[PDB]
Amino acid sequence: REHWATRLGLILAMAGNAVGLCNFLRFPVQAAENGGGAFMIPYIIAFLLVGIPLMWIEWAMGRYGGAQGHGTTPAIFYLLWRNRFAKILGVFGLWIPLVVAIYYVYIESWTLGFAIKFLVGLVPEPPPPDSILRPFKEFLYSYIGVPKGDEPILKPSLFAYIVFLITMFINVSILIRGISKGIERFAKIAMPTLFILAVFLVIRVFLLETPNGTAADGLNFLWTPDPGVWIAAVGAIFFTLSLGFGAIITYASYVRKDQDIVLSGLTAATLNEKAEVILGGSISIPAAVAFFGVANAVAIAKAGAFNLGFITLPAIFSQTAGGTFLGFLWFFLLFFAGLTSSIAIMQPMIAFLEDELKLSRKHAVLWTAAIVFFSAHLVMFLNKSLDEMDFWAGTIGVVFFGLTELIIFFWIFGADKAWEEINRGGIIKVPRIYYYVMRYITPAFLAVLLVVWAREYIPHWTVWITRFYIIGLFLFLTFLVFLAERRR
């Protein structure tokens, strides 16, 4: 079995797993949507009660299954629960990361295409708010092909489609080289490049000042202290830490049987929170508060993540010295943040085809890329198909799967056996208070917030096109698990 080469590469790959498009596009919107500092109190509590303990649990289940040559949840769930229903529930560990990748890599291709056009300077040129925002709103709308009539049909540009082929190629070139020579070798290069670009953008944004305000006013808003906020904070913690995607589990399956996971997992989770709360929150919102004030920035944040990251922020930079190049640094930061994460949610399908169907790494990567590339045409051409996948897999699915794997590992497999499996080989030991959080508090926290979510919030016909296709993806993945059974 493939293994991580160095301790540093494991941390950076796991950090690159978590540090992604959410740190810079999704977290600023959710924090500003829910009161800035008001959102942080549930966000911090969710990180301590859900994010941290589920980090250690997924590290344990991955290393446990990896020791037996099984990197994905269809087999690992069966190793922790000798039931055929554990294999069925494990399919979500293949379905969730595959569905999320189907729209994630496409949005990642947006950042690459924008970074290219912003580097060559093929960007809209506004003259001396709507008069400068419209050239950038139309720039994104022409790139992805926003519908102009009633038909919910996206018409991507030839450039956007070609950049998506390039983006898939860059993902394949990294994945096909393996864990150590591919994912780990790229993490040692991409994470320092990511941190430097983010710190520079934070510094440059902190120098923004207009009559409407300063960047410090946005920092004061996001740090000054409703069930919907608690749902938003816990959901954000899942997505930003890559929990519930089966991605941490597959990566951890290449950690050696006796290596530390307690300190290593805690460091990667901490690195992500630093990148998100310190670096990510200090760019988008402060630059918007500087140019529009706090009240308008909360209004701009409610307009969406794509609006702030692809329209508003490049339009703000277009008013500063060298802002076109600053937009390139911004979009290149997003591309490396997405690239280190998209390879992480495609590796589970790779590891499954390798471990359970005995496919060569080359074959597993190419077929996984074929499935993602083909399925992504739904996200590229059907309007709001992206939103439907992000809801079922990236929103509902991850919280459902997070509670599922905890019950399997810490209840069905045994609370004492799981706790001993987590701390085994750890440089440090998990604080004994977290044993009771894992066994009682975390599943109670998830079950309560998940019931309010289902009972109070979940209740166009084209959404069935996406539901029909991703339900078929689950059936197809179930059939592959069945074929893996028949071989044994």
Residues making contact with ligand BOG (CB under 6 A) = 155-158, 161, 377
User: Which residues 331-370 are close enough to bind ligand LEU by CB under 6 A?
Assistant: 341, 344-345
Can you spell out the DSSP letters for 409-469? Answer: IIIIS-HHHHHHHHHTT-SSPPPTHHHHIIIIIHHHHHHHHHHHHHHHT---TTHHHHHHH
> Binding of Na ion at residue 347 (CB under 5 A)?
no
The answer to whether 21 contacts ligand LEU (rule: CB under 6 A) is yes
Tokens standing for residue 384: 């709001």
The distance of closest approach from Cβ of residue 367 to ligand BOG in the complex, given in angstroms and rounded to an integer, is 17
Of 273, 298, 346, nearest in space to 22 by CA: 273
Identify which of 229, 296, 228 has the alpha carbon closest to the alpha carbon of residue 31. 229
Q: Strands 209-210 and 213-214: what pairing? A: antiparallel
Residue 23 sits in the site that holds ligand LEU (CB under 6 A): yes
Least CB distance to ligand LEU at residue 351 (A): 15
The answer to whether 204 is a known ligand-binding residue is no
- Site membership for ligand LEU, residue 239 (CB under 6 A): yes
Handedness of CA 326, 327, 330, 335 (dihedral sign): negative
**What is the nearest approach in angstroms of ligand LEU to the Cβ of residue 329?**
19
Cβ count near 207 (within 10 Å): 10
Nearest by Cα to 176 from 14, 358, 343: 343
Nearest residue (CB) to ligand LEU, 133 versus 334: 334
SS3 153: strand
Q: For Cα atoms 460, 466, 467, give the angle at the middle one, nearest 5 degrees.
A: 90
CA distances from 375 to 104, 306, 381, 385 (A): 12, 21, 11, 11
301 binds Na ion (CB under 5 A): no
Shortest distance (Å) from residue 474 CB to Na ion: 25
Instruction: In angstroms, give the least distance from the CB of 480 to ligand BOG.
Output: 21
Which residue's CB comes closest to ligand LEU? Answer: 20
Contact of residue 345 among ligand BOG, Na ion, ligand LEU, none (CB under 5-8 Å per partner type): ligand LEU
**Comparison of 101 and 418: residue with beta carbon closer to ligand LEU:** 101
Nearer Cβ to ligand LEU, position 182 or 426?
A: 182
Among 167, 240, 282, 466, binds ligand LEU (CB under 6 A): 240
Distance CA(281)–CA(283), nearest Å, equals 6
**Binding flag, residue 340, Na ion (CB under 5 A):** yes
Residue 212: burial class (beta carbons within 10 Å; 0-12, 13-18, 19+): middle
Span from 208-216, 236-244, 305-313, 420-428 in contact with ligand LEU (CB under 6 A): 236-244
Binding site for ligand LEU (CB under 6 A): 18, 20-23, 100, 239-240, 242, 245, 247, 341, 344-345
Enumerate the known binding-site residues for phosphocholine: 84
Binding site for Na ion (CB under 5 A): 16, 18-20, 22-23, 240, 272, 337, 340-341
